[PDB]
Ligand binder design. Structure first.
Ligand code: ADP
Ligand code: ADP
Ligand code: SF4
Ligand code: CL
Ligand code: CL
Ligand code: MG
Ligand code: MG
Ligand code: NH4
Lengths: 260, 268
């Protein structure tokens, strides 16, 4: 059988096609989010890779910030639930999940069943989110996808003193003007983000296993800096940005069984 | 006698030459702060315009972020003290001072002698400061000096839901694309700043007279929105951006009189 999960965030749209409730036969990410052609183009592509059509999908569930402004799905489910489901499907004994997306950072604490025990989120400040990195990458004139590997070359990381995205940009521009090494600039950028998010994590208390998901988790530099700041191993799946859409597809699989 | 006050902030450098502790004979703002060529060009303009030279100045005081790092003045004094002194010189019975500058906002509560009783400051976040306005003005393609007049024509403010400068910027850009009325976009911008600064005022407790100073107080749209948010009349001096330099020049006058009093002058 096939089920579908859609995760339409305010920054990107994520889709997964799941097989018999255990095999992803296609996944897709479009860097356009809620209220764009994001969802449309996502389906388009999944149908391509697998060669399937809407008829072939027994159940579809949508999650993320745009789930409600979207018809038609069978269920619309909280992205907190969907990320937890997807992560637990890949990584067992997960007790802390750190979701860093385009415009917010979330920390979930789970009980031994994968159910939510506690939760903290920054969604008011652009620092410590993907927007911080997106702004900086545009200032440094590289794609966000390169930052992880660029920072790997850093030998004398440049500190950013400002926690504010706006004041930090001014510091980075200044560093750029006096020819600080780009790799050292990026290293300090990664550290600013990790400092912000790790403070969130320390408030709820780290409990292993700690897993990072979200688009920003694709940035290996951020993951390293986070592991440094919280002083705990961090497990990252190979499909960090897609754990929400995976979770939604698994709730879809639940639904399909339910309609035996 | 002449004294001089210099207020070197992180955004702008301001200078005042004061005659006999009473008349401002020269004033000058240069939109470059610490540490640029800003202070030097302020001095050039004060001296140039008065034909005076360093020698004619009996005492010099420096204040602001960069007072340290400025050699040399007879004294370097807190900008809190300097704004309080300058404001009290101009506006009697002042009990609350709101200083909105390029990168922070401060609220001072003063006692009946003009002494600091309480204090709150946002200096970590660009929202609710001149930087927020500077960023938005760039986006809407208007000079920051034009914002006040534009906002006067607003009849239906376009509200900004985000408190963050970066997220708010995206909302404004969206409004511009939807061809929202510019005066209503600007009014919403002014309202965002006022909500964030007025929260400081309310925590400290408004006490009349309320005075706004700082370069952002030159934006009458910000002043109107502030008065609305705190539900109190706000007085703005003629020279809101220069009150720190004026306070410094007054402390310089105090120093000058003090040194006159450690000597006797005996004439026939
Ligand atoms: N290849 C990549 N490498 C590093 N970071 C990325 C990559 N692709 C996207 N991102 C980051 O992920 C963010 C969006 O992540 P996502 O979890 O999709 O957000 P949302 O769920 O809120 O839409 C973007 O801000 C971007 O910074
Ligand atoms: N004529 C004006 N109208 C509106 N805003 C102004 C005007 N002149 C300066 N500003 C704003 O005032 C701010 C600087 O204020 P100021 O009190 O000098 O800062 P600081 O003391 O921290 O250097 C800047 O953000 C600037 O854009
Ligand atoms: S600190 Fe900077 S990034 Fe955080 S909310 Fe304030 S303006 Fe936005
Ligand atoms: Cl200025
Ligand atoms: Cl002025
Ligand atoms: Mg998300
Ligand atoms: Mg100042
Ligand atoms: N993305």
């Amino acid at each position: 059988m096939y089920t579908m999960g859609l995760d339409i965030g305010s920054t990107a749209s994520k889709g997964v096609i799941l097989k018999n409730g255990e095999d992803i036969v296609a996944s897709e990410t479009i860097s356009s989010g809620t209220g764009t052609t994001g969802p449309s183009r996502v389906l388009e592509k999944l149908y391509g890779k697998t060669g399937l059509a809407r008829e072939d999908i027994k159940k579809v569930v949508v999650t993320g910030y745009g789930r409600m402004n979207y018809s038609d799905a069978d269920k619309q489910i909280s992205e907190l639930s969907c990320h937890a489901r997807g992560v637990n499907f890949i990584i067992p004994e997960t007790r802390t999940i750190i979701d860093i997306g385009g415009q917010d950072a979330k920390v979930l604490k789970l009980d031994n069943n994968g159910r939510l025990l506690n939760f903290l989120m920054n969604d008011k400040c652009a620092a410590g989110t993907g927007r911080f990195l997106d702004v900086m990458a545009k200032i440094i004139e590289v794609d966000v996808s390169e930052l992880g590997s660029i920072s790997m070359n850093s030998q004398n990381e440049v500190s950013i003193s400002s926690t504010c995205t706006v004041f930090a940009e001014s510091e980075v521009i200044s560093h750029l003007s006096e020819n600080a090494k780009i790799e050292d600039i990026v290293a300090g950028i990664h550290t600013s983000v990790a400092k912000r998010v790790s403070s969130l994590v320390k408030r709820i208390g780290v409990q292993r296993n700690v897993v990072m998901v979200g688009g920003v988790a694709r940035n290996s530099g951020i993951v390293r800096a986070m592991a440094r700041e919280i002083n705990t191993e961090i497990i990252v799946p190979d499909i960090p940005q897609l754990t929400g859409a995976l979770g939604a597809a698994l709730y879809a699989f639940d639904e399909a069984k339910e309609s035996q």
